[PDB]
């Protein structure tokens, strides 16, 4: 019945997806060969005897990242036809992703997706993993999203996106790609969860006591959030949340579909012994700016809706108490047009932890998804960055070379301006 199809696009998407699939396997007791020595069906198809296969498609315009998957630990988990590889990359160029390189591979991926979807009898929708900055993650994803919207439309679309940081950006052209993908994103995807690597790094250093976090550390954390989102479908709790339900609760207007997530508790092995990590505590920690996945100040914004997804040894009464306490905190403000700003999910299964992971095993955890006007600040800085570069037409020629027109850039900018303005208007 209830099944979710995962699409992993570009390097970032692939690597997050690897982590996710490692976690899922451990959660459901599926070995790396697909064997298990029922709810897992939401993520896996079952074929013959002693096999389960992820309902996932992995896509990259290069072979390198996917080739690791083929060689590696989980080579037997995925069948070869679900791992799609081109020959040349998008080379950090949106145009190459959306047009020049993407138009060669999109049909193939669509066909495979259709095949996958035909095997599922109760399609909930799609989880799309990518980045806004890369040529593939932007250009290819926008194309793919359009096609999916056309073919399916009413089936839900969710994207988990690595947003570019204010300070710590790894690539030069990021603002252009980000702006371009946003335009199509707004048109198509139904809710989009932004995340920032810088914030994750801060969290890992401050809360987990890790001097030097690598990408593997971020990815693991990110996967946890996804698990919290999908645990309501993969397990049977006391009080549950479906994806459609989530959408209904968390998105007040069609355009305003960017809720930023956060997780609690993120703690070390030792630092867990001393702390009495109660429901109240974790809830309180959720609404603190320092534990956010996107860099911004909520104190300077207003909340429009928050969804709290609890998991493990949690009882409703104490959650209610926590919520009440949060209500009475003047520094956490909700917009006046939504007096009741909470959707609450409680699931029985404690968060499972990956062997060799940075996170300690806890009885309780929470994933908060909140829509807040403060996210507009990120867009403002990104827009500013875009505007500087465009003032000199820096790098623009490359995009033009691959068939992009200058007018598109301007259009995209306009679209983002309009979006920011919309956000402004709802907070009044």
């Amino acid at each position: 019945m209830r099944e979710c199809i995962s699409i992993h696009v570009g390097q970032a998407g692939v690597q997050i997806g690897n982590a996710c699939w490692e976690l899922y396997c451990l959660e459901h007791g599926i070995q790396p060969d697909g064997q298990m020595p029922d709810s897992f069906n939401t993520f896996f198809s079952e074929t013959g005897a002693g096999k389960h296969v992820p309902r996932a498609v992995f896509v990259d315009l290069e072979p390198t990242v996917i080739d690791e998957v083929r060689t590696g630990t989980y080579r037997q988990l995925f069948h070869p036809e679900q791992l799609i590889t081109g020959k040349e990359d998008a080379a950090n160029n949106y145009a190459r992703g959306h047009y020049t390189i993407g138009k060669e591979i999109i049909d193939l991926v669509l066909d495979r997706i259709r095949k996958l979807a035909d095997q599922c009898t109760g399609l909930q929708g799609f989880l799309v993993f990518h980045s806004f900055g890369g040529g593939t993650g932007s250009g290819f994803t926008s194309l793919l999203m359009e096609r999916l919207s056309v073919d399916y439309g009413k089936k839900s679309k969710l994207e988990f996106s690595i947003y570019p940081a204010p300070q710590v950006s790894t690539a030069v052209v990021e603002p252009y790609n980000s702006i371009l993908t946003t335009h199509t994103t707004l048109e198509h995807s139904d809710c989009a969860f932004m995340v920032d690597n810088e914030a994750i790094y801060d969290i890992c250093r401050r809360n987990l006591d890790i001097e030097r976090p690598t990408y593997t550390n971020l990815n693991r954390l990110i996967s946890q959030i996804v698990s919290s989102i999908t645990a309501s479908l993969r397990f049977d709790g006391a009080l549950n949340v479906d994806l459609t339900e989530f959408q209904t609760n968390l998105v007040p207007y069609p355009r305003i579909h960017f809720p930023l997530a956060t997780y609690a508790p993120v703690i070390s092995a030792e630092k867990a012994y001393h702390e009495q990590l109660s429901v109240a505590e974790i809830t309180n920690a959720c609404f603190e700016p320092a534990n956010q996945m996107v860099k911004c100040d909520p104190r300077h914004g207003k909340y429009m809706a928050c969804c709290l997804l609890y998991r493990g040894d949690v009882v409703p009464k104490d959650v209610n108490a926590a919520i009440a306490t949060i209500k009475t905190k003047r520094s956490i403000q909700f917009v006046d047009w939504c007096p009741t700003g909470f959707k609450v999910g409680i699931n029985y299964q404690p968060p499972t932890v990956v062997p060799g992971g940075d996170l300690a095993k806890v009885q309780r955890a929470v994933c908060m998804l909140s829509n807040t006007t403060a996210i507009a600040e990120a867009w403002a800085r990104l827009d500013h960055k875009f505007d500087l570069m465009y003032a000199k037409r820096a790098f623009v020629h490359w995009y033009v070379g691959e068939g992009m027109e200058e007018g598109e850039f301007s259009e995209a900018r306009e679209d983002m301006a309009a979006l920011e303005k919309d956000y402004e208007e709802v907070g009044v």
């Binding site: 690791e68 040349e88 160029n93 790894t170 030069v172 790094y201 030097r212 003032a391």
Partner: protein, 426 residues
């Protein structure tokens, strides 16, 4: 997938190429016979980027060796690794160019070139998806400069959508090896401006400085100098040959580092570089590597980065490293040295990381900078050209090879324009 075609033109170029090949074979576990004797499966995974697989479990460089003189070819064939090259890929003339760009570009080189073209077409046909070309040469002589340029023009005409990379050893100011160097450089630089997508400006003087000051090396030979260049070359394409955490190939680098079409002249750099004595008294860490790379005295081009601004800089890291640490270090350098970076391109730094370190080292780095200080190199050359040309000195030889004065006028104008453009964007 993603095959690169290597071309070596003239003596210097050939020599550098030999070194390059030697290093890369070692890296991929390939012996002097062409047989793989490595340990890691990662060494063979992407072997096809630089090697064709021949019959009986052997590998052969996708390399073309070009010279107007045969002696160089012989010297290469007799070298350690000489036997790895395909015999049919040696394309040599009999005459030489006599430090004359015109002989290399118009006359002897012209006669030579068709053979080379035929070879390289075949090499292209063999490869399933050629990403592009790497030419190693110098600008100061006749073959590498005139013949090389000619070859490049021909290549681009047939492969206009492919990536065109040159590693060009440029004439230094003080150490002037020849008398007509200004002419040859000027003529070749012009051609490079229109036909290369990225040009790595390597300078002998800077290399010497590195060797003397940083390595503390008692007696540098050309081989030693060449080694440095080879390392740098290896660095750029590490992402095509190995896995990594963040991967960037030749195209990705160009797109991030070239904001305007003409501004594609890089000052490359490498780190770490220590003596035998100073090996013990050092920290093998990312902060130290970063510190080394950004220093002016570690640049392989004889230009002061403190005399200009960085338009863009690409850093390529090799070894097991924390991404956060790498990011911190690059942000710190741009914040602390704000004045050396153009302020209208936010985040002037691009980062790439490959998990596989070079042999002998746990961590290594390669630097590519697009600095406005490169104007100094062009300006000096222009000046020297003017000084010659005003009195028509040595012109007669060039004209005897069919060249006209007007070409010289054009090239000089072009270079001047280029210089101006760099200055204005500073």
């Amino acid at each position: 997938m993603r095959e690169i075609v290597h071309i070596q033109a003239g003596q210097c170029g050939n020599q550098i190429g030999a070194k390059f090949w030697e290093v890369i074979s070692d890296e991929h576990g390939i012996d002097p016979t062409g047989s793989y004797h490595g340990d890691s499966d990662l060494q063979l995974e992407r072997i096809n980027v630089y090697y064709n697989e021949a019959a009986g479990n052997k590998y052969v460089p996708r390399a073309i060796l070009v010279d107007l003189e045969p002696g160089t070819m012989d010297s290469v064939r007799s070298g350690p690794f000489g036997q790895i090259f395909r015999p049919d890929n040696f394309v040599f003339g009999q005459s030489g160019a006599g430090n004359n760009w015109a002989k290399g570009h118009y006359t002897e080189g012209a006669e030579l070139v068709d053979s080379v073209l035929d070879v390289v077409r075949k090499e292209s046909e063999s490869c399933d998806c050629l990403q592009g070309f790497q030419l190693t040469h110098s600008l100061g002589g006749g073959t590498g400069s005139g013949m090389g340029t000619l070859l490049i023009s021909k290549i681009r005409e047939e492969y206009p959508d492919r990536i065109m990379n040159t590693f060009s050893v440029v004439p230094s100011p003080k150490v002037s090896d020849t008398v007509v160097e200004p002419y040859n450089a000027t003529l070749s630089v012009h051609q490079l401006v229109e036909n290369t997508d990225e040009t790595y400006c390597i300078d002998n003087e800077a290399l010497y400085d590195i060797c003397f000051r940083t390595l503390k090396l008692t007696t540098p030979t050309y081989g030693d100098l060449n080694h440095l260049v080879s390392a740098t070359m290896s660095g750029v394409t590490t992402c095509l040959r190995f896995p990594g955490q963040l991967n960037a190939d030749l195209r990705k680098l160009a797109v991030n580092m070239v904001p305007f079409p003409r501004l594609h002249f890089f000052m490359p750099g490498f780190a770490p570089l220590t003596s035998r004595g100073s090996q013990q008294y050092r920290a093998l860490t990312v902060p130290e590597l970063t510190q080394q790379m950004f220093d002016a005295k570690n640049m392989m081009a004889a230009c002061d980065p403190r005399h200009g601004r960085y338009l863009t800089v690409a850093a390529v890291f090799r070894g097991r490293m924390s991404m956060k640490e790498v990011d911190e270090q690059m942000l710190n350098v741009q914040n602390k040295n704000s004045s050396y970076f153009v302020e209208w391109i936010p985040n002037n730094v691009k980062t790439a990381v490959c998990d596989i370190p070079p042999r002998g080292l746990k961590m290594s780095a390669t630097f590519i900078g697009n600095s406005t200080a490169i104007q100094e190199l062009f300006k000096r050359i222009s000046e020297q050209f003017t000084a010659m040309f005003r009195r028509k000195a040595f012109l007669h030889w060039y004209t005897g090879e069919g060249m006209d004065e007007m070409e010289f006028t054009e090239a000089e104008s072009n270079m001047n324009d280029l210089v101006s453009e760099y200055q204005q964007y500073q």
